[PDB]
Point group: C3
Chain length 344, copies 3
Amino acid sequence: GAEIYNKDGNKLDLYGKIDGLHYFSDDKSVDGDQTYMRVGVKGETQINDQLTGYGQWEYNVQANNTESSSDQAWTRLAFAGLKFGDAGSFDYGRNYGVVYDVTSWTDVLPEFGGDGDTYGSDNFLQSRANGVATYRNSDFFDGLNFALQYQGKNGSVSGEGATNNGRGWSKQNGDGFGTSLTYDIWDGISAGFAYSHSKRTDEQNSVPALGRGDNAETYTGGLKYDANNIYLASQYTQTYNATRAGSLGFANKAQNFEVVAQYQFDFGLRPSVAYLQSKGKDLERGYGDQDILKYVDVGATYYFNKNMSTYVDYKINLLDDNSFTRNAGISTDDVVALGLVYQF
Amino acid sequence: GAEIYNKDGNKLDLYGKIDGLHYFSDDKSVDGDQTYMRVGVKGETQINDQLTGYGQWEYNVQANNTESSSDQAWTRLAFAGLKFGDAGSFDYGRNYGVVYDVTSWTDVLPEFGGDGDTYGSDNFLQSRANGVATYRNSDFFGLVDGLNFALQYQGKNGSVSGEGATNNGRGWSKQNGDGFGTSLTYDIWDGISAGFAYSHSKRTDEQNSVPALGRGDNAETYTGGLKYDANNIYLASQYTQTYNATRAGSLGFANKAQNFEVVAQYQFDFGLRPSVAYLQSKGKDLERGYGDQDILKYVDVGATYYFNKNMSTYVDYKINLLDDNSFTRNAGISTDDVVALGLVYQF
Amino acid sequence: GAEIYNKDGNKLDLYGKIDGLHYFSDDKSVDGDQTYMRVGVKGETQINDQLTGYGQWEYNVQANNTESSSDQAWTRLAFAGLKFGDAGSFDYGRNYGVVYDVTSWTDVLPEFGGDGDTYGSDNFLQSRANGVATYRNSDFFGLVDGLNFALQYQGKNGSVSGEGATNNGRGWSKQNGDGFGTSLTYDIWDGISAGFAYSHSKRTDEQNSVPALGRGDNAETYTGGLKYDANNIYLASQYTQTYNATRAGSLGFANKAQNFEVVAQYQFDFGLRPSVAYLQSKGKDLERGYGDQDILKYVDVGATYYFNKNMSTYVDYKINLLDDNSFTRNAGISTDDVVALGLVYQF
């Protein structure tokens, strides 16, 4: 983040990165150039002694396709808020669902991991989401962070279930809420829990073959060790009608586990190993139990300084190629990524 | 505000906002999350004692849809110009048609009003438009304080292909032929103002052949308006008569229309700013049996609370007065009420 | 320019322009408003005494169409890199192919010329390209002053689907296989420069099956250029011979092509810069009975007035010498003349 303005109680921070990134894989929908950049602004205005206003915007711009390609930029974050001293905060807009307050702890791989793996974006309150109202509280009115979050319906393009901002069933949601709780038990050791409950939409219960139910729910617990140049974290999440069974629908229930170990050398190298799986249960069309995601991750980042880094990441895919993985379009091939990153 | 660069006669102002916004309505095409942000840059360069060069860009970025959605960002303004002291200024690009130099006086509602209501964008010289050349003069060459005028030309913006095409083609509703416009505002006191604007554009072939409604070779607008803005009080009205220029929803254009807007506001010292307004658009001589039809009719009541110059919150309540009829249904015109709630950070 | 951040060994430069631009032409796909803007960031971080890290992004935003139009913005450049003192530099991203290290010498017309004429973007290593790794060496390891060379590799950018696919698939016209290129330039005197460039890329199976024109496993370019730049005079020429690498409009590629560009300019002290140029592209051995064909042929006359480093105005007149024939019609190649007028704010 680069502070480009700070005057009369108003500050403006410009941030972002250019990620020169290549993927190597037998999966042709993944293989090739993946260069992209992100640009954002964080703004803060002092209102009074007990009140600060703020806003943030984060934009993703792909740079790996041609100058006539379409749909190459999208907003990741866009929200405005009030901070009432230390007595917490409120914001509304496109922001992270509170489930990520805990699952973010395993989202630290050099390249892979995070949204797209055990959960996705626009996926109820599991990641970035449209129309979230988020109340947060530090030190529970000590060191104990609480959030409560509401999300209005984001429905179909047209018909009964429509809203202004309609989309496909995979990215729809009804009215929902979430809550998170995180705590530093020792110095360095944190624990966290999160819960979300959302109504599903009529299209989610009629267009895809997989996943039926009135409500989507997530229960998450997570642990993190972050001291002494060591980073360990795990996340265990159980879901009902909330995890995507590739292109085929949702899984009636799923169990997602993510664990990672890393070490940070003084001279800037940071090796990383991780394991991720997603186990879907009670799937329609005779699928039954099925692996949705399963891989070991190894790689490393070298940090030249706080503004420049290079990395390699290797996804060792353990999924077996079967009828479910083919029909749902889930990749079973390995991937290697190489990148060079400038950040500001 | 936000001057991020001011060095050797060149300055750069980065401005914009992040508007956390939700609509509540029985209209499903309007209801729900409406979060969006604006970002722009105002730049100015001193060339010599008598000559300043400038440009401005303004972009709108929706944040209310997904990361795989289409067409979520667009340019509102992009223009470059020269200012020659009190001999006037000239700019070319995407800019406001001069009609808006008067109708902007009523575009002060907490959330509603403005483009989308009695006029829209890419709607001849009524709002933001492609390819306008605009000459402006303030205080009549420095000789008459408070007297401003504008002269404006717009090149044809035509079909996607065929005979009527230009490089930058669009659908008939946002097309225009060659056109011009003029405006004139006068500050009688330092709070009271009167203003007039006129425009005349050629219509294109698609505007006369594709939609069912509206026939004619020319689009004309006549606008008069009044404004009181002082002593914490804001009263403004605008009356506009149009010919082949006002959209009849998706069905075409109204052969003639009468648009009226009026608004009253008060700014309390602690930062609350209530607002009441009334807006209507009456269409006349519509084809296919429609005859005279209301295109828009509503009362608006709301309020903005300014925390400071960088942060506000607002409610706005559109009490819709249209009857649900054959015209409104076939033209895609909303007849439902709307409530808006917003929280806005601005820089 | 516009250094908006410089602190603790890290620098950020915000650059761009707002170009208010109109084209006049009988060619209706070219005629009309062409206003656009560019915005960019050049970033630099000192890592140690011998090593600098850097990144650059450049975005093109059209402003000549409506707020509901599609595909109005795109990335021209996006790359990250390391500079190793005088051992050289390495960057990867969307960047210029090295052939343009020489052909850029003739890309100096007031408005026309450059990509879109004798070569295009996403056209192997002739202009801006996805996925280029580029090594550059200055002054031949600090030894021979004015001698620069570059070595470049590009990975496959393939079809949207099927056997030839990559993640970032596109049309046959903008596809490439694995490829490499090299450039060499030398300032023989001050003001005078010579340069060579070569490139070799595999072609894709879609390029050899979908369009009717152009067959071969490999695309190749050979380029030589000269430049005089001194005493307020600018002269430059570029000659390029290509194999399976030059677009024959929409119909495919030319099995062989010969491209030639030459330009002459003078800079007057009061800011006027007149320009005259000639560009041709001659295609050989085209299938379907086309044979030898002119792909491009025009004389260019124009001028730019620089008010200062931040503002300019210009006119350019393309005098088109192509004869209208069945090749030009079917390939979509314009044979009409065009005048451009522009007013530009730059930061």
